[PDB]
Design a protein around this nucleic acid. Structure first.
Length: 546
DNA sequence: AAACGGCGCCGTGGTCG
DNA sequence: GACCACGGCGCCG
């Protein structure tokens, strides 16, 4: 239609050989301005003719550009506009179908669609001053940060993981043999069907749980938990489950994903994938790397700094409860955080009517259960189960909780009232989620929706704050010669030359804690290490002084 | 805490061959 | 035999 190159401000369209930009061949590149499409004769060379990537999935093209040594930032992307209007807008195909046009497999058509959808979606954002603020001050600049994170990747200790694989392989084989013995015949332990036979037919154990959909007897951790003490075969299966889980999902796959050009591992940070405004991570998911068990901790050790560099790990402490304090205005919850006290200890002190010094471990763990339970509307029935106490004693506990934090109850009631009346809920900054079924006739469907309504404002506000912090911090890091590697919702992992790592840590803390004024301080824990686990361990050791 | 809701491995039954 | 969609199960915050 028109020869390459396009005029200024053109929208890009592109086709990759695969979805993962760090691995993909750029097959086709095109640009549209005024409905006129320019197709590139040779895509890679044609990248140099763009000042920025403006278009659907602009970040993905920016990542591939960075891989080829080219500093092409992402700009406007209609996906971000659509996501802000309605976070159920998660794919170009779905956005096209809903808002107009069609997502095809041809670069030129993708360029024209990008240009048209941008104008369509921009139009619908007129007068939406808070969404526009989020677009301009958070999402659009974040896309550039995410591009540098994905293209940088993270260094992995492959030999450590090769070794760890062997070690765990041995333990798996042991457990398998010990289980087969107790079964009196071999089978596939990985098969939940075979296992459901063995456990509940052959060995005749009690099955108290059902699967979610198939209506079968569950072999889940929850279903089997109460059979654990009395039945060692169960104990061995759960051990086998954990090891095979971590080996098959993490220990074995990750070494094979090291990139030949970078020597590093590259994830994707999906910016329009969640209903709450959180990022997600995929290919692989580096926001689900094990950490909680002994073996999980050992996997975290595999994530290492470049030679001469250190990882910096930063963590917003109790970000959900601090957000709740701000959103609710509950003066008692605000006071806790203002005074630097331990929310779970303080809750327990009032719950059990003891001075904070007399709070014992059982009391704190109950208060902690209650504290997080309030984020899902404070169910009395679910409280009775987790603490293993009469339903009526659960109700009493809840009443006692709301006596000390009455504006949290107020916030709960208000969130649901507005949700019911307006049809959506929102974060502090005005990110919006439409939540149906808040007046559903079926109690289970209704309550499930209520839990979504409470979730999104808290988790979504925390996401908005972390995103804004990333946007603020990233240029500062660039100046100091440091990198931003991972985000795990309330956590950031940076990488800095070892001599500057301490200053990077101090700067990052300050930016994150000062990101935005709330009724309470944001507290950020910070650790420095040669691997991800050491860095997190260091954060705790430092927290004592700090 | 893991309650929501992200993402990924696994085995299974159906389908085409 | 090769391939796929579906759902069990469970990692993380």
């Amino acid at each position: 239609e028109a020869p390459w190159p396009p005029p200024e401000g053109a929208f890009v369209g592109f086709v990759l050989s695969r979805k993962e930009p760090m691995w993909a061949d750029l097959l086709a590149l095109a640009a549209a301005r005024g409905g006129r499409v320019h197709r590139a004769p040779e895509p890679y060379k044609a990248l140099r003719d763009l000042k920025e990537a403006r278009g659907l999935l602009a970040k993905d093209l920016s990542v591939l550009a960075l891989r080829e040594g080219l500093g092409l930032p992402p700009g406007d992307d209609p996906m971000l506009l659509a996501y802000l209007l309605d976070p159920s807008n998660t794919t170009p195909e779905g956005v096209a179908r809903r808002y107009g046009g069609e997502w095809t497999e041809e670069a030129g058509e993708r360029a024209a669609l990008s240009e048209r959808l941008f104008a369509n979606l921009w139009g619908r954002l007129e007068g939406e001053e808070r969404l526009l603020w989020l677009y301009r001050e958070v999402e659009r600049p974040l896309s550039a940060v995410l591009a540098h994170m994905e293209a940088t990747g993270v260094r992995l200790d492959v030999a450590y993981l090769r070794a760890l694989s062997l070690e765990v392989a041995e333990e798996i084989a042991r457990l398998e043999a010990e289980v087969f013995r107790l079964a009196g015949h071999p089978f596939n332990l990985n098969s939940r069907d075979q296992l459901e036979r063995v456990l509940f037919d052959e060995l005749g154990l009690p099955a108290i749980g059902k699967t979610e959909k198939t209506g079968k007897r569950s072999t889940s951790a929850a279903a089997l938990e109460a059979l654990r003490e009395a039945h060692p075969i169960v104990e061995k299966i759960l051990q086998y489950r954990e090891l095979t889980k971590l080996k098959s999902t993490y220990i074995d796959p990750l070494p094979d994903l090291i990139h030949p050009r970078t020597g590093r591992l590259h994830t994707r940070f999906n910016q329009t994938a969640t209903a709450t405004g959180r990022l997600s991570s995929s290919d692989p998911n580096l926001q689900s790397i094990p950490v909680r068990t002994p073996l999980g901790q050992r996997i975290r050790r595999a994530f290492i700094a470049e030679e001469g560099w250190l990882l910096v790990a930063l963590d917003y402490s109790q970000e959900g409860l601090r957000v709740l304090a701000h959103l609710s205005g509950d003066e008692n919850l605000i006071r806790v955080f203002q005074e630097g006290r331990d929310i779970h200890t303080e809750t327990a002190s009032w719950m059990f009517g003891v001075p904070r010094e007399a709070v014992n471990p059982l009391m704190r763990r109950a208060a902690k259960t209650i504290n997080f339970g309030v984020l899902y509307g404070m169910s009395a029935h679910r409280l009775s189960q987790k603490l293993a106490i009469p339903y009526e004693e659960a109700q009493a506990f809840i009443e006692r909780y709301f006596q000390s934090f009455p504006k949290v109850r107020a916030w709960i009631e208000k969130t649901l009232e507005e949700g019911r009346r307006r049809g959506y809920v929102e974060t502090l900054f005005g990110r919006r989620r439409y939540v149906p079924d808040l007046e559903a006739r079926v109690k289970s469907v209704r309550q499930a929706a209520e839990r979504r309504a409470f979730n999104m404002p808290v988790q979504g506000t925390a996401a908005d704050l972390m995103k804004l912090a990333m946007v603020k911090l990233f240029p500062r890091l660039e100046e100091m010669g440091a990198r931003m590697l991972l985000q795990v919702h309330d956590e950031l992992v940076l990488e800095a030359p070892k001599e500057r790592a301490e200053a990077v840590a101090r700067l990052a803390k300050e930016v994150m804690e000062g990101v935005y004024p709330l009724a309470v301080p944001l507290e950020v824990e910070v650790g420095i290490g040669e691997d991800w686990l050491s860095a997190k361990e260091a954060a705790k050791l430092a927290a004592a002084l700090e």
